Design a protein around this ligand. Structure first.
Ligand SMILES: CC(=O)OCC[N+](C)(C)C
Ligand SMILES: CC(=O)OCC[N+](C)(C)C
Lengths: 406, 394, 427, 414, 380
């Protein structure tokens, strides 16, 4: 028969996959752990879970799996099913669901010197703490913690994987260009790898891989930011409509309704984490409060416009502060039967004079309203511009650090 | 190791994993059970199911799995798959949409004295009744009941490792603060087997909800719309937009009520705080709309049909505006042509009288508007306090 | 008795068949595996999570010298069926899946022949990661891909290939996805334009690795846009016509801003629905998304212009000055350019003079208000004539550009071969 | 430990594929009891009832008997259920592929061969929802247990007996039981049902059904859905006091109330199932108030047309004016210079008189609109009140039946 | 019993589940396949996937599994796990979301003559094209293609148990009515093995949708808003709420169109009739909005700017509705009189414009009434 079958029969005569390959009692099996990312599928912020398609580059040395290739027709290496050989239980301790082990269970590669290399593929759903302060113009620092579930430091010794030539250690996530599909929403800025030790327990040792991925905010800018900028532009416009036209309140509360709808429909995107408030949510709340104040001031302007001498008397201070001082600054400055017939015509003239004085005071009230809404227009324009510029400047300044801390 | 290989072959050669690890059948297996909370995954309020990532640390002593280390090259601790040895049948009593027991079956530590240290992972999706009385500032007491299913206290006994669950490596959830946590052990006599008690350990976590997210995304817009509810009384009737503002506030509160229902369970044990607030502000908006309709109808009372009552005038013109001071309220054939002049003058006088009466009606409506403005501002400022500060004081 | 039992026993138990050993006579040899795909139903293509769910049949074919028998010696048995768990099979897996389904769904029996030929045709449901190019949505075409690689062996031990058919005594490779007319169902939303099959070898990798080779099946499928045109594009176009139509409303009725804002809100609702229907990728803004953004910006401009018209209409000579330049450019030049439609007695006499003066002032006020109204009307007419053609041209240009997004005639750039089933490569 | 020797003796020549009948035509009696630990949820969308129950199955296996005197007084052992024969009692009423129990706990085996298997289970059982009186409804959900493999000639499903009498109800242990908070268990009967269309050599001939007559607690739905819907739908009554001028916005208010009712319809559609057997009670109320709102919008259009018409467009007939002014209000409470000057003054007076005369008919049309508004206000108020009261009265009178079975005088309670 | 244990030990002592149950390899296994629909779980219209709970009854004869009852105490029927015997590989060809084959592996009846009756439960999520042409009053012809995968006609043959699937134990779905059902057997030549045929049985169910739920939730509000569309014309222009009502109706119809879109698959095989009705009523609402803004602009025509055409005047007035200081004071009085005359004639022309607006509204209302009455006639 094939000498491969003979070699497999000889190797696994007394092999036990439940036993560590410590040649001497007390030895530690040096296990090299590396990661090869093929696709970063999604980062679900709602459940704080990142799922990736990865290859686990594992390597160790088993003294039992040794043979002389010269005595077996030049067989330098074999491909053995992964269940037939001992393997360290390198699992994802950071997994959000109950998916610790790998998925594919590919064959291991056993060489005649005893070196075993195993590269299983798996879809791993790890848990990532989401820093939501600068969402969506932000970056996330998502980790994958890999260590043997059972064997501690006294039994295995985790290390870093080697490169293709093997002369050095690679301290980063290996990305194969021929198989990597770049995610359309996240760009991998830094992908370092480091070994962490915890104090107060020397038996702990793990290898963690970091993905400092920066979100591309074009989707949220197009579908949420620009419509809200248009709505705020409308909110500013409501202090330019005449109070005579009965469309001021309709515009103001329609803007408020639009902002509320955009805030509510954003709830399925923003995570439920309560540590901080996302900067887009802060912007939406700023616009909502500004539009609410615009509604209140539009109500005030409409109330001032419809006043009359029959309802209100003009205060001295209001007139002095709104007709004299503000319009210079705002450039809004305004520019027998004959006896009975005679008595009737005189009464008509008296009524016309009274009506003229009445509408003169009414026009004074309307002019006070006009000055008030022009001042509110300038103030709201300045406040909205400054707030929007400051918020977006702070969002733009948020960049990942130049060097990771690993 | 050849030594470890010989040891594992010797341990499982005549080992039966069906039988309890006791020297005599009258004795009981002493098992030390400890819960180690790792991560609070989610708290589903609608389904009343809490998902947690735990490590169910269990220890017991198996006499059949002891060896002398000097006969095996000095090995003192080995590791075996859990499927090769007897395991306690620890079951989550209050499981809901999950697995009742351990399914992963990872390996376990085993020293030379027979002591077994098994720490399998588990995602416990457990039912716990969610008290929505003080939502979203609520505090939930979620429990996890663990007990041996088929063995009673005289056969297999458990004991908590410590009075509190282990949270040394607990990952911060970012939505709940672990205010307290403890574990109590009970002897329960069930109707199925009343002769012997069945032991269990119930780990309860007192979780306090961080309310910032719900305050920002729900409570603040509702507060804004409640503020704008009473603002319609400062809007003059002549604008013809009072109904627009009121009905827009009503539609906003309807949409937010639709939002709230999907966030809380449909349980009827107790009315929620936010539900009471929503009902209060809904009644507030309905009352404001009704009063607005009353004011608008008062503003358009035709003087030719509705004469001004004496008491209405006395109340709303003479006394009340004089009382308030915060607002600036007022406190030949040529004779045919002459006959036409007389007719148009009399028409002018009658129109002036009618306009004066209409002005009186509008003034009454405005006074009613100011009174209702003050009353509704006071109600809006005291009702929100009465709803929220009762819980915020703690 | 059945001779199949005797033959199967002789093949497996008597010969001591090992399913964990490659079927080669020497270790240095290679095993040729012929792979083919048979698409029976394109189940769905969810753009929200970039998943292509397909119902396919995987055709494997390889030789195994250990499964050879003399047919005449076993009472003329020409074929056998064996479960996969009893014989060696190449573990071809889908590398670019979204879930843990690397393998086929059902492990059906293999068919073996006396010459050693083994054919395995299991059905499978695969959810591969197809990057969605949303640039020309909904008139788009997607270049989805299924990547199959043999991770259990390296290229020196297993060589993947494309299955070969025979016509007129000549062998040609099957470089396409096989579609059986009696077992294929049209999706109803996606039309299969191209379906090439390629064998990829990466020269920068080493032959002794598991990433040296793969066989890829591509599905270049275009979306039939009739549903989206009828249900999304048409109401968007119809509602957007009302925005430019709001200029025709007189300023007297308070329904100008109401109409414009309502059109804006409807456009925003459609924009939110489109965002719900599309992934959150930032590679490019969709065509319909760009159209909606353009329409919303233009409607916002219409709202601003309506506010300006309302402000100009309600101006009063006691609060504003009708300047000469504005008058001469808004009721002399622009309306013509736009072709718009065109003692007691002494006391009584003093009182009559006063009332005549008041009527004169009222008429002058009315004339000023009428001039402001005409200014507002001509601004409305100018804005309509400057915005309506912009809306029409933008809509027509966007939809013509979307409609002309034909998928390319050849599936791969620089390759003259069309990868069509009716034109074999070497036959 | 003698348990090892005993279990190795019992399972040494034991195979789990054989029903333990002593002789031919021997029927194995299998008794069932259900212990409802917690009624988890009743998902209306998929018509699934999720319950956390302990199902108690008892039968007799003669192969699993031993003499206690030869095993040091051991009379009870625990054997994993995977190593023993089971009667394969499954839930034939499941919504998914889960027929068997979730955990497969150990089986208590007594020295006389009695088997006592009590595994925990989470059962998702179908039951159609009677939406006819939502949300004041009561659901008659049930769980059907049948032997998936054996028939009535091989096993005999029965209800367990405690003190010589059958159980015939879902047992509820006072320890470890939690009220659902939305559903109250009014009745929990149990009986063995025969399907007489089949013969007794078929597997589905005999069943054991545990019923659950659960009544919904409607306080949550009243406070969160019904009361806001009623308060909003009462605002269309207010549209008759708004003026019929350009302001007031009668049509705006009525249309917006109709829109709010549509929002409530979308909200309720996310609660009730998608089944088409009946219209939900609150759905009927919503349809009724939508029709009332549409009629009120039509009436607003009518009174706006009547109030805003002029004598220059319509002719005010004396019949209509008399009918709406004397009948309905009776029931309801409601020298060349001199010549030129004379001609100019006469023209001014004539024009003023004509203008004042033309506006008289406008006021008459306004009064007609007011009278129609008052009458239609009373009609709409009566209609809305009667509809609301009748709908919620027939919801309130949806009493749970006194007996678990209408034709059975038994109470089926412990 | 001892007899049954001995019998089962004897039957499977040298039984090979790989090999087909035929005396000679040239013969074929005759398999009687029937379906028993238990419950239609749901019909996912958007995904075009129908999940059903079924019992896949299968019968065949195994020569190797026969015994003489007199040698085993008189037992004539036993039950064995399905994994211990040869099983046909019935595969759902059109599976879309579940398992192609049977996965539960329940026990099967076994007669002493060798007859095997196997009834395994399964849930079949099968893809069937959903014809949305007459939604929600439509009927769906959903199929389930079951065939033997790896064996051809000359190796294993199947035959339907009866011409119709069994629905004796079928429980009412509450959303669909089982109008008709029948099974057919086919001989299909695939491209993979063109030299031999493969047998299959396709069970089709004709399910008529119960439309009460969609009538209540969708059709009735759409009819309400469609009726409110015509009340715009009767609404006077001076109220200033015409555009409010029209816009609200249009937005409501758009929202319901979006809901209907969410309720149907996005396939463009055929436009739904409800979709056509929604599109046509939206077209009608848009046309009424155009006409009502025309009538609003007409009502506000300033007579000093727009002159009344003669043809408009006749066609909308005559035909269709029939179907020192003393002399300064005197000069001021004359000026007042002539200004009053000018105002009177301007008001007369404005009233003419308003009359034209009213008659345009009336003829539009009559057109809407005609559309409504012909629609109600076509309903009858
Ligand atoms: C004894 C048995 O098998 O049932 C366990 C019941 N329980 C969980 C109440 C102890
Ligand atoms: C022959 C084989 O194994 O595949 C069968 C494919 N089918 C069902 C289309 C004939």
């Amino acid at each position: 028969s094939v000498m491969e079958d003979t070699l497999l029969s000889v190797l696994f005569e007394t092999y036990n996959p439940k036993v560590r390959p410590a040649q001497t009692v007390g030895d530690k099996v040096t296990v090299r752990v590396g990661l090869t990312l093929t696709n970063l599928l999604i980062l679900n912020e709602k459940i704080e879970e990142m799922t990736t398609n990865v290859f686990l580059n594992l390597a160790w040395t088993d003294y039992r799996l040794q043979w002389d290739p010269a005595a077996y027709e030049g067989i330098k290496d074999l491909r053995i099913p992964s269940s037939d050989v001992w393997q360290p239980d390198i699992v994802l301790m950071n997994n959000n669901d109950g998916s610790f082990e790998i998925t594919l269970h590919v064959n291991v590669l056993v060489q005649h010197t005893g070196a075993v290399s195993w590269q299983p593929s798996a879809i791993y759903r790890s848990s990532c703490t989401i820093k939501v302060m600068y969402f969506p113009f932000d970056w996330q620092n998502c980790t994958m913690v890999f260590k043997s579930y059972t064997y501690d430091t006294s039994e295995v010794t985790l290390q870093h994987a080697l490169d293709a030539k093997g002369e050095r250690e690679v301290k980063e996530i290996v990305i194969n260009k021929d198989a990597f599909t770049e995610n359309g929403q996240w760009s991998i800025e830094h992908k370092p790898s480091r070994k962490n030790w915890r104090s107060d327990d020397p038996s702990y040792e793990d290898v963690t891989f970091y993905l400092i991925i920066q979100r591309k905010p074009l989707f949220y800018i197009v579908y949420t930011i620009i419509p809200c900028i248009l709505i705020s532009i409308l909110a500013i416009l409501v202090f330019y409509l005449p109070p005579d036209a009965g469309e001021k309140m309709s515009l103001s509360i329609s803007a408020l309704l639009a902002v509320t709808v955009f805030l509510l429909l954003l709830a399925d995107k923003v995570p439920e984490t309560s540590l901080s408030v996302p900067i887009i949510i802060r912007y939406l709340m700023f616009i909502m409060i500004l539009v609410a104040f615009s509604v209140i001031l539009s109500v005030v302007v409409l109330n001032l416009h419809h006043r009359s001498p029959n309802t209100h008397t003009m205060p001295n201070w209001i007139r002095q502060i709104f007709i004299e001082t503000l319009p210079p600054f705002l450039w809004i400055q305004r520019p027998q039967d004959l006896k009975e017939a005679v008595e009737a015509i005189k009464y008509i003239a008296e009524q016309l004079e009274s009506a003229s004085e009445f509408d003169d005071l009414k026009k004074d009230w309307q002019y006070v309203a006009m000055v008030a809404d022009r001042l509110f227009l300038y103030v709201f324009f300045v406040i909205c511009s400054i707030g929007t510029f400051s918020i977006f400047l702070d969002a733009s300044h948020n960049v990942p650090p130049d060097n990771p801390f690993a | 190791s050849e030594h470890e290989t010989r040891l594992v072959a010797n341990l499982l050669e005549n080992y039966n994993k069906v039988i309890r690890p006791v020297e005599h059948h009258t004795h009981f297996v002493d098992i030390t059970v400890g819960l180690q909370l790792i991560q609070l995954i989610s708290v589903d309020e609608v389904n009343q199911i809490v998902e947690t990532n735990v490590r169910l640390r269990q220890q017991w002593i198996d006499v059949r799995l002891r060896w002398n280390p000097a006969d095996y090259g000095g090995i003192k601790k080995i590791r075996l798959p859990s499927d090769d040895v007897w395991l306690p049948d620890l079951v989550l009593y209050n499981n809901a949409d999950g697995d009742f027991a351990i399914v992963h079956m990872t390996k376990l530590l085993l020293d030379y004295t027979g002591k077994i240290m098994w720490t399998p992972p588990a995602i416990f999706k457990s039912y716990c009744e969610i008290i929505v009385t003080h939502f979203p500032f609520d505090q939930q007491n979620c429990t996890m009941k663990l007990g041996i299913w088929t063995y009673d206290g005289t056969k297999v006994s458990i004991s908590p490792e410590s009075d509190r669950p282990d949270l040394s490596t607990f990952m911060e959830s970012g939505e709940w603060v672990m205010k307290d946590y403890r574990g109590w052990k009970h002897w329960v006599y069930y109707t199925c087997c009343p002769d012997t008690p069945y032991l269990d350990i119930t780990y309860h976590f007192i979780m306090q909800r961080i309310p910032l997210y719900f305050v920002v995304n729900v409570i603040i817009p509702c507060l804004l719309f409640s503020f704008l509810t009473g603002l319609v009384f400062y809007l003059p009737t002549d604008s013809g937009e009072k109904m627009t503002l009121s009905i827009s506030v009503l539609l906003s509160l309807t949409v937010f009520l639709l939002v709230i229902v999907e966030l809380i369970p449909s349980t009827s044990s107790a009315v929620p705080l936010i539900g009471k607030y929503m009902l209060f502000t809904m009644i507030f908006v309905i009352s404001s709309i009704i009063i607005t309709v009353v004011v608008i109808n008062t503003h358009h009372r035709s003087p030719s049909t509705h004469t001004m009552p004496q008491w209405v005038r006395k109340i709303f013109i003479d006394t009340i505006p004089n009382v308030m001071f915060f607002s600036t309220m007022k406190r030949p054939d040529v004779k045919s042509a002459i006959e036409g002049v007389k007719y148009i003058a009399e028409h002018m006088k009658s129109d002036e009288e009618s306009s004066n009466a209409a002005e009186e009606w509008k003034y009454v409506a405005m006074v009613i508007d100011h009174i209702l403005l003050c009353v509704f501002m006071l109600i809006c400022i005291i009702g929100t306090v009465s709803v929220f500060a009762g819980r915020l004081i703690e | 008795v059945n001779e199949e039992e005797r033959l199967i026993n002789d093949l497996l138990i008597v010969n001591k068949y090992n399913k964990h050993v490659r079927p080669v006579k020497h270790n240095n040899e290679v095993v040729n595996i012929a792979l083919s795909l048979t698409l029976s139903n394109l189940i769905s293509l969810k753009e929200t999570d970039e998943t292509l769910t397909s119902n396919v049949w995987m055709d494997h074919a390889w030789y195994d010298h250990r499964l050879t028998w003399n047919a005449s010696e076993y009472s003329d048995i020409s074929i056998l069926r064996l479960p996969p768990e009893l014989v060696w099979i190449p573990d071809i897996v889908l590398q670019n899946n979204n879930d843990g389904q690397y393998h086929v769904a059902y492990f059906c029996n293999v068919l073996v022949r006396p010459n050693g030929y083994v054919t395995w045709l299991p059905p499978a449901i695969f959810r591969s990661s197809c990057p969605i190019n949303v640039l020309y949505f909904p008139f788009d075409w997607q270049n989805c891909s299924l990547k199959f690689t043999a991770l259990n062996y390296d290229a020196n031990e297993i060589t993947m290939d494309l299955m070969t058919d025979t016509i007129d005594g000549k062998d040609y490779p099957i470089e396409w996805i096989i579609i059986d007319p009696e077992a294929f169902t049209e999706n109803g939303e996606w039309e299969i334009i191209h379906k090439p099959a390629k064998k990829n070898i990466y020269p920068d990798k080493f032959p002794n690795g598991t990433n040296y080779q793969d066989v890829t099946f591509y599905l270049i499928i275009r979306r039939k846009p009739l549903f989206y045109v009828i249900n999304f594009i048409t109401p968007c176009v119809l509602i957007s016509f009302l925005a430019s139509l709001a200029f025709y409303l007189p300023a007297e009725s308070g329904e100008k801003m109401s109409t414009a804002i309502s059109v804006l809100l409807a456009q925003a609702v459609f924009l939110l629905l489109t965002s719900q229907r599309l992934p959150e990728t930032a590679l490019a803004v969709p065509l319909i998304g760009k159209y909606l953004m353009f329409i919303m910006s233009l409607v916002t401009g219409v709202i601003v212009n309506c506010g300006i018209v309302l402000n100009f209409h309600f101006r009063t000579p006691s609060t504003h000055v009708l300047s000469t330049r504005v008058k001469q450019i808004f009721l002399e030049k622009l309306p013509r350019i736009l072709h718009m439609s065109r003692d007691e007695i002494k006391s009584g006499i003093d009182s009559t003079n006063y009332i005549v003066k008041q009527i004169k002032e009222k008429n002058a006020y009315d004339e000023e208000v009428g001039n402001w109204n005409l200014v507002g009307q001509t601004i409305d007419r100018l804005s309509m004539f400057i915005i309506t053609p912009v809306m029409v041209l933008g809509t027509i240009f966007i939809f013509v550009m979307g409609n002309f997004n034909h998928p390319p005639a050849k599936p791969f750039e620089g390759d003259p071969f069309d990868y069509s089933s009716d034109h074999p490569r070497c036959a | 430990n003698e348990e090892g020797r005993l279990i190795e003796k019992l399972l040494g020549d034991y195979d789990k594929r054989i029903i333990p009948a002593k002789t031919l035509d021997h029927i194995i009696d299998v008794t069932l009891k259900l212990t409802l630990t917690n009624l988890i949820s009743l998902n209306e969308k998929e018509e699934a009832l999720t319950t956390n129950v302990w199902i108690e199955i008892q039968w007799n296996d003669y192969r699993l008997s031993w003499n206690t005197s030869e095993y040091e007084g051991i009379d009870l052992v625990r054997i994993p259920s995977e190593l023993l024969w089971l009667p394969d009692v499954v839930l034939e009423n499941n919504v998914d592929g889960q027929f068997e129990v979730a955990y497969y706990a150990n089986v208590l085996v007594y020295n006389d061969g009695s088997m006592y298997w009590l595994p925990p289970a989470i059962y998702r059982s179908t039951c159609p929802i009677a939406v006819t009186y939502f949300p004041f409804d009561w659901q008659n959900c049930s769980l059907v247990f049948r032997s998936q493999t054996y028939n009535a000639h091989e096993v005999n499903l029965q209800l367990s007996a405690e003190e010589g009498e059958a159980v015939e109800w879902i047992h509820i242990d006072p320890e470890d039981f939690t009220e659902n908070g939305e559903w109250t268990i009014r009745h929990r009967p149990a009986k063995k049902n025969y399907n007489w269309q089949l013969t007794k050599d078929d597997t589905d001939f005999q069943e054991i059904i545990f019923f659950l007559i659960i009544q919904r607690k409607p306080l949550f739905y009243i406070i969160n859905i019904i009361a806001p819907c009623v308060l909003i739908s009462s605002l269309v009554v207010l549209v008759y006091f708004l003026p019929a001028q350009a302001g007031g916005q009668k049509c705006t208010l009525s249309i917006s109330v109709l829109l709010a009712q549509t929002i409530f319809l979308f909200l309720i559609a996310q609660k009730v199932p998608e089944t088409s057997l009946n219209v939900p009670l609150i759905g009927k109320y919503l349809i009724f108030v939508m029709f009332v709102s549409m009629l009120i919008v039509m009436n607003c259009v009518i009174v706006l047309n009547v109030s805003l018409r002029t004598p220059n467009t319509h002719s005010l007939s004396e019949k209509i004016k008399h009918l709406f002014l004397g009948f309905l209000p009776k029931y309801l409470g409601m020298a060349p210079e001199i010549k030129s000057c004379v001609e100019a003054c006469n023209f001014i007076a004539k024009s003023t008189k004509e203008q004042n005369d033309s506006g008289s008919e406008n006021e008459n049309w306004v009064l007609i609109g007011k009278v129609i508004d008052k009458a239609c206000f009373w009609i709409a108020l009566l209609l809305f009140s009667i509809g609301t009261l009748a709908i919620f009265l027939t919801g309130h009178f949806n009493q749970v039946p006194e007996f678990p079975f209408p034709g059975d005088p038994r109470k089926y309670v412990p």
